[PDB]
């Protein structure tokens, strides 16, 4: 049978996992995923002090091609908050595995073309986690100090993946004056509530 033959490589091939069985090695997870082919993996624990593999289902991994990022993520279930794989089969059952890829091209939250990125109009925004997108950053500043032209989070040029804080670029009105002088505020959003930082760029 056939229905589609297109491919996409505009997703970040690094995927976090946590649903792995209580006993796992790199060949168990290589058999857990499909279409990913051969891949590279890293564990939160792998020292000779106990074992070459972690005592928990937590893992970080990536594979050789970026086209299977969309093919495998499409062969599984998703949520607006996270992804899930239906690989329940080995020593773990009835519970899908946690999945989190990244969007190496959505890391840019453009809002208006009247002002591109510039060192005299850039602003810094600190306190964002890595697993989140600039969603929480651009939306809070647009709900109380709106007028933004560009927004995003700090990333590694190595794989275009988050590494810490974030930034925005607008200088349109006193709304930017109100957020650049409001270097601490309250949001009650996600695992964060207060004292997030907002200051001029350097």
From Swiss-Prot:
Parent-protein residues present: 460 to 661 of 729
Function noted in UniProt: Sequence-specific RNA-binding protein that binds to the cytoplasmic polyadenylation element (CPE), an uridine-rich sequence element (consensus sequence 5'-UUUUUAU-3') within the mRNA 3'-UTR. RNA binding results in a clear conformational change analogous to the Venus fly trap mechanism. Regulates activation of unfolded protein response (UPR) in the process of adaptation to ER stress in liver, by maintaining translation of CPE-regulated mRNAs in conditions in which global protein synthesis is inhibited.
Region (RNA-binding): 82-84
Gene: CPEB4
Domain notes per entry: The 2 RRM domains and the C-terminal region mediate interaction with CPE-containing RNA. The interdomain linker (564-579) acts as a hinge to fix the relative orientation of the 2 RRMs. The ZZ domain (509-566) coordinates 2 Zn ions and is probably implicated in mediating interactions with other proteins in addition to increasing the affinity of the RRMs for the CPEs. Unlike in CPEB1, a continuous polar interface is formed between the 2 RRMs.
Listed name of the protein: Cytoplasmic polyadenylation element-binding protein 4
Expression tissues: Expressed in pancreas in islets and ductal cells (at protein level). Expressed in melanocytes.
Compartment annotation: Cytoplasm; Cell projection, Dendrite; Cell projection, Dendritic spine; Postsynaptic density
Summary of subunit composition and partner proteins: Interacts with TOB1.
Site (RNA-binding) location in chain: 14
Site residues, Important for the positionning of RRM1 relative to RRM2: 102
Ranges of residues in domain RRM: 13-104, 121-202
Family recorded in the similarity comment: Belongs to the RRM CPEB family.
């Amino acid at each position: 049978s056939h229905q589609n033959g297109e491919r996409v490589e505009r997703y970040s091939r690094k995927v976090f996992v946590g649903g792995l069985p209580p006993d796992i090695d790199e060949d168990e997870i290589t058999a857990s995923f499909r279409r990913f082919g051969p891949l590279i993996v890293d564990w939160p624990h792998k020292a000779e002090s106990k074992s070459y593999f972690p005592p928990k289902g937590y893992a970080f991994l990536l594979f050789q091609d970026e086209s299977s990022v969309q093919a495998l993520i499409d062969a599984c279930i998703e949520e607006d908050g996270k992804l899930y794989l239906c690989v329940s089969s080995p020593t773990i059952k009835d519970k899908p595995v946690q999945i989190r890829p990244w969007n190496l091209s959505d890391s840019d939250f453009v809002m208006d073309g009247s002002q591109p990125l510039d060192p005299r109009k850039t602003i810094f925004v600190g306190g964002v986690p890595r697993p989140l997108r600039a969603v929480e950053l651009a939306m809070i500043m647009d709900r109380l100090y709106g007028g933004v032209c560009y927004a995003g989070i700090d990333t590694d040029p190595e794989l275009k993946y988050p590494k810490g804080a974030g930034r925005v670029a607008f200088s349109n009105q006193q709304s930017y004056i109100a957020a650049i002088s409001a270097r601490f505020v309250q949001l009650q959003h996600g695992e964060i509530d207060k004292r997030v930082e907002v200051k001029p760029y350097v």
